[PDB]
Paper text:
The norovirus genome contains three open reading frames (ORF1 to 3), where ORF1 encodes the nonstructural proteins, ORF2 encodes the capsid protein (VP1), and ORF3 encodes a minor structural protein (VP2). The S domain forms a scaffold surrounding the viral RNA, whereas the P domain contains the determinants of strain diversity and recognition of attachment factors. There is considerable antigenic drift among human noroviruses, and new genetic variants evolve every other year, which can result in new epidemics worldwide. It is well known that human noroviruses bind with various specificities to histo-blood group antigens (HBGAs), which are present in saliva, on the surface of epithelial cells, and in mucosal secretions. To elucidate the constraints on non-HBGA binders from a structural perspective, we determined the X-ray crystal structures of the capsid-protruding domains (P domains) of two GII.1 (HV and noro485) nonbinders and one GII.2 (SMV) HBGA nonbinder.
Similarly, a GII.2 strain, termed Snow Mountain virus (SMV), also failed to bind synthetic HBGAs but weakly bound HBGA B type in saliva. In contrast, SMV infections of human volunteers were shown to be independent of the blood type. Compared to the P domains of HV and noro485, that of SMV contained an insertion loop (SMV numbering; Ala345 to Ala351) in the P2 subdomain, which was also observed in a GII. In the HV and SMV P domains, we found two loop regions with disordered residues in the P2 subdomain, i.e., no discernible electron density, which suggested a certain degree of flexibility in these loops. In the HV P domain, Pro295 to Asp296 and Glu372 to Asp375 were disordered, while in the SMV P domain, residues Gln295 to Asp298 and Trp378 to Asp381 were disordered. In HV and SMV, loop B could not be modeled into the structures because of the lack of electron density. However, our new data indicate that Asp375 in HV, Asp375 in noro485, and Asp382 in SMV are unable to participate in the stabilization of the fucose moiety of HBGAs because of their flexibility or suboptimal orientation.
Numbering used by the authors: 225 to 294, 299 to 377, 382 to 532
């Protein structure tokens, strides 16, 4: 089966590491030469990796049960489908959980498991919450995270992400210790990097909302969520380690620039600057052909 990309403009692409629309394509800073994010990870032949799952509503979201009220609550997390999480499962953590250090802001909602006498429907409550992912309390692989905001113990919760609380401790390329400092992370999607001098990573960037403070925080993903979804659907065999892709202006049919789309599921370009890529609104990538690591990209 021939490999393809979905046909989607930048305005039709979603971030795979936070559930928001893409704002820009962006070339990696000089300091960012290797990354190992765990959401938005998928091989070109459709194998999801890391903590990647298919639903936008799963990205940086989680479900679980409140086990303790301390402003702070301990949550025993489940899989997103509500089934109990088995730490023995060969994934880094429940699929969808945040893959970066930061203070994730969203809303925790709670619907009671049973109805009160005289009520035909369950009681509900919900509150703003912060989920720190850089502290020892963030141990989703051990089945527990801590949130700060009442909430009932042993009643199920949903966390809907909105943005970051603030930029304190926001390091998008530092993978959390999913099982705490005593345990190595396991079953990680591998690190990716340019290996051709003068190439750098090409990111799909979103500027996340903030609850407060100064900032315009960026989260960069390797693949849009729709690309992950498409690759999984097609399951097209990869015929080499590198797919040459070109960004097309559809009304002219001309290629504006070219990029390497690597088998592991990430892109590199030939560029000397870290900056937003300025492109027409109607443009999109198209698969050209399979090449190899020695192929030299035209400067963009």
């Amino acid at each position: 089966k021939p490999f393809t990309l979905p046909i989607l403009t930048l305005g039709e692409l979603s971030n795979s590491r936070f559930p928001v629309s893409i704002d820009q394509m962006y070339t990696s800073p000089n300091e960012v030469i290797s990354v190992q994010c765990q959401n938005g990870r998928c091989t070109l032949d459709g194998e999801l990796q890391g903590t990647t799952q298919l639903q936008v509503s799963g990205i940086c979201a989680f479900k679980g049960e409140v086990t303790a009220h301390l402003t702070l609550y301990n949550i025993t997390i489940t899989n997103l489908n509500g089934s109990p999480f088995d730490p023995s499962e060969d994934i880094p953590a429940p699929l969808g959980v945040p893959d970066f250090q930061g203070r994730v802001f969203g809303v925790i909602t709670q619907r009671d498991k049973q109805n009160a006498a005289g009520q035909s429907q369950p009681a509900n409550r919900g509150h703003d919450a912060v989920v720190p992912t850089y502290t020892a309390q963030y141990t989703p692989k051990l089945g527990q995270v801590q949130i700060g905001t009442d909430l009932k113990v042993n009643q199920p919760v949903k966390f809907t992400p909105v943005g970051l609380n603030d930029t304190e401790h926001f390091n998008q390329w530092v993978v959390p210790r999913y099982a705490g400092a005593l345990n190595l992370n396991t079953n990680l999607a591998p690190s990716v990097a340019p290996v051709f001098p003068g190439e750098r990573l090409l990111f799909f960037r979103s500027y996340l909302p903030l609850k407060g403070g100064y900032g315009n925080p960026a989260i960069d993903c390797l693949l849009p969520q729709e690309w992950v979804q498409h690759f999984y659907q097609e399951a097209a065999p990869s015929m080499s380690e590198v797919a040459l892709v070109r960004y097309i202006n559809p009304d002219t049919g001309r290629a504006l620039f070219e990029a390497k789309l690597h088998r592991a599921g990430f892109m590199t370009v030939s560029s000397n600057t870290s900056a937003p890529v300025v492109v027409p609104a109607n443009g999109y990538f198209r698969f050209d052909s399979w090449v190899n690591q020695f192929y030299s990209l035209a400067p963009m």
